[PDB]
Amino acid sequence: SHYKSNVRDQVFNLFEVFGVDKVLGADKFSDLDADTAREMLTEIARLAEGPIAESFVEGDRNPPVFDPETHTVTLPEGFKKSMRALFDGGWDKVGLAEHLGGIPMPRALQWALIEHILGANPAAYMYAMGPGMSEIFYNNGTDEQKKWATIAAERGWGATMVLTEPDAGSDVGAGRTKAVQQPDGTWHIEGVKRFITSADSDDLFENIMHLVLARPEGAGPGTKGLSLFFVPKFHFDHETGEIGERNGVFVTNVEHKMGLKVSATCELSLGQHGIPAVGWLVGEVHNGIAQMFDVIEQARMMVGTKAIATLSTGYLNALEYAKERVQGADMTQMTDKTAPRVTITHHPDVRRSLMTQKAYAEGLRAIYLYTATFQDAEVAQAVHGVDGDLAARVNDLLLPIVKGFGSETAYAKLTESLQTLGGSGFLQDYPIEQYIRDSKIDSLYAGTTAIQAQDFFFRKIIRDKGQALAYVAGEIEQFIKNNGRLKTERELLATALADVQGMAASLTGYLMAAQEDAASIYKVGLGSVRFLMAVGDLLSGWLLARQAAVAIEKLDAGATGADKSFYEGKIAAASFFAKNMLPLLTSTRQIIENLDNDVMELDEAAF
Amino acid sequence: MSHYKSNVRDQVFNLFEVFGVDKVLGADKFSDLDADTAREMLTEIARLAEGPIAESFVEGDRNPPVFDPETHTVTLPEGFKKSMRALFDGGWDKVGLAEHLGGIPMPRALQWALIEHILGANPAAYMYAMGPGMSEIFYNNGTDEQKKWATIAAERGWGATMVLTEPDAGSDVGAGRTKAVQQPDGTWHIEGVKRFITSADSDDLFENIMHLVLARPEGAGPGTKGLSLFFVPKFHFDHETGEIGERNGVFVTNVEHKMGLKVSATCELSLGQHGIPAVGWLVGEVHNGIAQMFDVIEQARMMVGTKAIATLSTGYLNALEYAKERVQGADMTQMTDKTAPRVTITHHPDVRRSLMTQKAYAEGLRAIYLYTATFQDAEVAQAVHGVDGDLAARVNDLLLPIVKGFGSETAYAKLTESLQTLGGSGFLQDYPIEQYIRDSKIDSLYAGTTAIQAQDFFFRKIIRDKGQALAYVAGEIEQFIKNGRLKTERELLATALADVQGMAASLTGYLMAAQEDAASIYKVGLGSVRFLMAVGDLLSGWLLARQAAVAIEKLDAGATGADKSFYEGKIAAASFFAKNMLPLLTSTRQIIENLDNDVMELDEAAF
Ligand SMILES: CCCCCCCCCCCC(=O)SCCNC(=O)CCNC(=O)[C@H](O)C(C)(C)COP(=O)(O)OP(=O)(O)OC[C@H]1O[C@@H](n2cnc3c(N)ncnc32)[C@H](O)[C@@H]1OP(=O)(O)O
C-alpha cells in the first residue's frame, strides 16, 4: 500500500470541470452513466491500492531473470499474481472496442482509470497493453488480419512495439532491420532490435504480437521506406488461434536499469538463430511509420500519465509523512529553546514544498484529462464545441506537453516529495526513491524531451499553421477576460499568455530567418524545450485557475466538510501557482528573444 | 579506464591563474611545498582516484555492506577494502592534517581540491577515511591528556564517526534524549539510541573507531545548549601506549538500505543497551557540546558540497565523451533531407545547450568551493584577498551553506542533463550517471537539509553577522562590474546583483516586521531557499566572468592548442551563464517581493 489514490480529484475534473458526464448514458455511451463511472474508478483504485501495489517493491528488489539458452524471462511470483488480478477484473479491456470485448467509455475516463495502475505498478500496465495494440492492429489490418486481431484480444496476447536498433533510436529512419518477401506473400524479418519492452514476459500470455518496423529489400531510406509487420512469437492457427510452432524471434539480452526493473527491456534478434522470423505486412500496404505512430501516440500518452500518476502518489506520501512528523518549533518561536514542538507542516518551507508538489501534481492531472477530452470526436463536440478535425489537431498539439512537460515536471517535483521526508526519504523503506528511479525513464523512451519539443514546434504548430495552438490560446484569453477574487490570477495569466505568445513569435522569427541563413534555425533548437515547458506552465496555471473558479462557486453555494477543504485547496493551489511559477516565464521569454549561435560556433574541443 | 573523469586542469587554473594561491606556496608555513609540488600532488591523487579508488565504485553499489547480527559488525566488499588500502598506503589520510599529527602542511584550497578526486571516484572512501581529520578536531578541543589519545588515534589511523541524530531528533539536534551519567572515576556512561550514523562500523579497515557523541548530562538544561560532546571509543585502550583492550558498550544494531551511497554503512548505533556501558570522556572536560561538534559539522558541510560538485563534474565529462562519439540524426540545417549525412550529437542545438549548462554549473561550482576555501586559512585570505582573520572567518561561514545547499541542489538537478545526453542508455547501469544521481540525492539531506542551510544562511550568516561578510562579497562583485568583450556579462551581472540586493531587503523587511506582526516571519521561511539559490547563481555568474577575464588576457598573450581551447570554453561558459541563467533572478526577486501567508493560513486538511 505504497500507492495513494485520488479518485476525488479525478471525478472533480471529469464532471465538475470538464463535464464529461454530459455524454454518459447517451449515444456510444448509452449503457454507462455517471454513477457507474464513479464506481469503476473507485473499484480499480481499490485494486490498484491492494493486489497491484503489493508487488511494487518486489518487482524492483526481485527483477526478472533471463535464461539466455531458452531466450526467456522469469518474473517474480508476486508481480505475476498482481497481473492476474488485473486480468481477472478485466481491466486490460477498458475503452477497448466493443467488438473486441471492451466496455465503451470516453477516453477521459479510460485514462483516469489507467492512472491508478500506472501509479501503483506502472510496469503492470505495460505488460497488459496487448489488447489495446490488437485494436490498433485491427484498425490498420486487412479483413483477414482483423480476425487475428480479434483472436489476440480475446486470448489476451501480449504485444510489443519494435523500432529501436543500436544505431537508430531517435533517428528511427536509420534502422537497418530488413524484410525479405517470400513467394507466398509473407516476409522474413532479419535484424537486431534493442531496448524492446515486454519482448518476453514469462508465462503471462500464450503469445506475444510483435509489431516490427523493418525496411523491405530495395525500399528507399528514412522513415518513408519503412514498413510495419505483425511478427508473432508463436505461429498459430489463423482460424482457431491455436498456438503452434515457435517463430524465429528471440530475446538475446535483458538490460540492467536504474528503475522500472520489473519491465523486461530486451535485445530482440529476428531471423538470426537459423529459424525465419515470419512477418505479415500490416494492412498489406507499405505505410510503416504512419501505422506505428498510432502506437507511438498511445505510448506517449501513457508515459506522461505514468509520470503524473507517480508524482501524485509521491506528493500524497510526502503529505501524510509531513502530517505525522514532529520536528522543531514554530518559526514564530524559533528563539525559544522550550517552545512546543510542531509537526513539519507548520514550517513555511515544508508548506512551500507541499503546495509546489500539489499544484503541479493536480495541474498535470488536469492537463492529461483535458488532452483526453479531445480524443473522442463526440466528447470533443459535447464539452468543447469543436469538430473532429480540430479535436484531433488539438489532441496532437497536447501530446508532447503531456509526455515532454509531464515527464520532466514529475521527476523534478519528486525531488521535493523526497526532501519532505528528510533523511528517511533516502531510504528504500519509503517508496519515493523508487518513484524517482522508476520515473527517470519517462524523459527518454517514447521519444526524448528534445524530440517532444521538436515535434511540438515544427509539426504541431508550424505544419499545423498554428490552428490548434490558436484554439487553446483563445480559450485561455476567454477565461482571462470573464467575480474578482480571481482578479490577480487573471492578471498573472495574461502576462504569461503574452509571454508564451512572445516565445512563439521569436522562434517563428528564427525559423523565417533560416530562409536567408540556415544556421539561424539552430536558435529554434536552442529554445525548443524551454518553449515546450513554458506552454506546460501556462496550461497548468490556466487549468488550475479554472478549477479555483469552480471551487469558489461550489464554496459560495455552501460546501461543507471534506468538500470544503478540497475546494479551499484548489483556490490556494491556483493562487500559489500563479504567484510563484508563472512569472518566471517573463524571464524565459526575454532569454529566448536573445538567443545567439555562440554556443553552436564554439569549438567542440572547448567543451 | 574508470567511470571517474578528473579535471586537474580546471583545478590548477582556479588555484593559480584565478585566485593566486601559489603566491603563499614555497614560503613560511608552506615552505616545503611549491607550485610544482602542489600540481604533482593533484595529478597523483587524480590518478589514484581514476584507478584503484574508482575501481570499486560499481562493486560497492552492486555488492553492498552486510550487517551481521551474530557479531554486531558490518562486512565490506573485498574490492572496496582494496581501494581503501590504496588510499591509506599513499598517505592520503593526512593531506592538510596538522604536521604534529604527521600531516603535510598545505592551503585548504589545495586540500579540498585533492579531496574532490576521491569524492568523484568513490565518495564513501573519503568518509571512511575521515578518522585522522576527526582526531585533529578532537585534539584542538581536548585536554592535554586527551591530546595524547588523539595523537595515538591519528598515528594509528583509527576511524571516526559524528553521532548526533536520533529517531526523534534530526534537524532539531537539541531535542535529543541520549543521556550521560557521570561515574565516580570521572568518566561517563552514555545511554541512548542514535540513528543514521555514517561509518558506525567498518569491518576490519581499522583497529579502533572514535565515536564523537552528543549527549545530555543528567540534570542539564534543554535544547542544544544542554548538550555535551563525548569521546566514545569502540574499544577501550591503553591511554599511553594505545594498545587495544576490551570492547566498549557501543554497538551497531542495523544497517540502512538506501537509494545510493550504498557502500557507506549507515547504521543504528546503540549506546549502553547490550549489557556493558558505553564509557565516554567529556571532550576538553567542559560542557560545550554543540559548539564543539560544529567544528565537525562545518567540515562535513564542506565535504558534502564538494562531493556533489565532484559528482556533477565527472557526470558532465562522461556525458561529453558520450556525445562526442554517438552518431544520431542529420544536422538541423538539413533536417528535411532524409539522405543528409548523419552527425554526432554534439552538433544538435539542444545537446549543446545541455552540455554548456552542465559545463557552466560544474566549473562555476568548482570555482565557488575553491573560492570558499581561500578564506579558510588566515594566511591565504590575507595574501590573495587582503582580509584579516576575523573577516575571513565570517566570509567562510557565509559561503558554507552555499557550497552545501546550492552545491547539493544544483549538482543533482544538472546530473539530469548529463543522463539525458546519453538518451535511453543513460537509464542503464552500464553507464555511471544513474549511480551518480542515486549517490548524490543524499547530499541535500545529511549535514543539514537545504532548508536548514538556507535558514542558517540568512539568520546566522547575514542577519546575526550584520551583513558584513555579505557586504564584502557584494563589494568584490561590484568591483568586477566597474572594471569591452565582457561588457554584456557585466551588464547582466549588475542586474543580477541588484536582484539579490532586493531579495535581501525584502526578506530583512519580513523579519523585522515580525516585531509588530509575528506571522511576518513565515515569509522569510517561504523565500529563504530561493534566496540561497539566487546567491549561488550570482556567485557562479561572477566567478565564471572572472575566469573569462583571465581567459581573455591569456588568449591575448598568445595561448595555443589545448590551452587556447580551455580559455575559449571559459569565455563561452561565462557568457552563456550570464545570458541563460542570471536573468531569471529578476522574476525570482519580484516573486519574493510579493510573498504572502495564504499558504500558511490554509487548513492542513486542504492539502
Ligand atoms: C502496445 C503494447 C506495446 C507497448 C507497451 C510498452 C510501451 C512503453 C513505452 C516506451 C516504448 C518506446 O520507447 S517505443 C520507441 C519510441 N520511438 C520514438 O518515439 C521515435 C523518437 N524519434 C522521433 O519521433 C523523430 O522525430 C522521428 C519522427 C522518428 C524523425 O523521423 P523523420 O523521418 O525525420 O520524421 P518526419 O519527417 O517529421 O515525418 C515522418 C512521418 O512520420 C509520421 N509522424 C511524424 N511525427 C508524427 C507525430 N507526432 N504523430 C503522428 N505521426 C507522426 C508521419 O507519418 C510523417 O509523415 P508525413 O505526414 O510528414 O508525410
Ligand SMILES: CCCCCCCCCCCC(=O)SCCNC(=O)CCNC(=O)[C@H](O)C(C)(C)COP(=O)(O)OP(=O)(O)OC[C@H]1O[C@@H](n2cnc3c(N)ncnc32)[C@H](O)[C@@H]1OP(=O)(O)O
Ligand atoms: C567527521 C568524520 C566522520 C565521517 C562521517 C561524516 C561525513 C558524513 C556526512 C553526513 C554527516 C551528518 O549528516 S552528521 C548530522 C549533521 N546534523 C546537522 O547538521 C543539524 C542540522 N540542523 C541545524 O543545523 C539546526 O538549525 C540547529 C543549528 C541544530 C538548530 O539548533 P538551535 O539550538 O535552534 O540553533 P541556534 O540557536 O541558532 O545555535 C545554537 C548553537 O549552535 C552553534 N551553531 C549553530 N549554527 C552554527 C553554525 N552555522 N556554525 C557554527 N556553529 C553553529 C552555535 O554554538 C550556537 O550557539 P550561539 O553562538 O548561537 O550562542
Ligand SMILES: Cc1cc2nc3c(=O)[nH]c(=O)nc-3n(C[C@H](O)[C@H](O)[C@H](O)COP(=O)(O)OP(=O)(O)OC[C@H]3O[C@@H](n4cnc5c(N)ncnc54)[C@H](O)[C@@H]3O)c2cc1C
Ligand atoms: C526502458 C526503455 C524501454 C524502451 N522500450 C522500447 C520499446 O519497447 N520499443 C522501442 O522501439 N524502443 C524502446 N526504447 C528505446 C527508446 O525509445 C530510445 O532510447 C529513445 O527513443 C532515445 O533513443 P536513444 O536511446 O538511441 O538516444 P539518442 O537518440 O542517441 O539520443 C541521445 C541524445 O541526443 C539527443 N538527440 C538525438 N537526436 C536529436 C535531434 N535530432 N535533435 C536534438 N537532439 C537530439 C537526445 O535528445 C539525447 O539527449 C526503450 C528505451 C528504454 C530506456
Ligand SMILES: Cc1cc2nc3c(=O)[nH]c(=O)nc-3n(C[C@H](O)[C@H](O)[C@H](O)COP(=O)(O)OP(=O)(O)OC[C@H]3O[C@@H](n4cnc5c(N)ncnc54)[C@H](O)[C@@H]3O)c2cc1C
Ligand atoms: C545517508 C545518511 C547518512 C547520515 N549520516 C549521519 C551521521 O554520520 N551522523 C549524524 O549525526 N547524522 C547522520 N545522518 C542524519 C541526517 O543528518 C539527518 O537525516 C538530517 O539532518 C535530516 O534530519 P531528519 O532525517 O530527521 O529530517 P527532519 O528533521 O525530520 O526533516 C524532514 C523535513 O522537514 C524539514 N524541516 C525540519 N525542520 C525544519 C525547520 N525548522 N524549518 C524548516 N523545515 C524544516 C526538512 O527540511 C525536511 O524537508 C545521516 C542521514 C542519512 C540519510
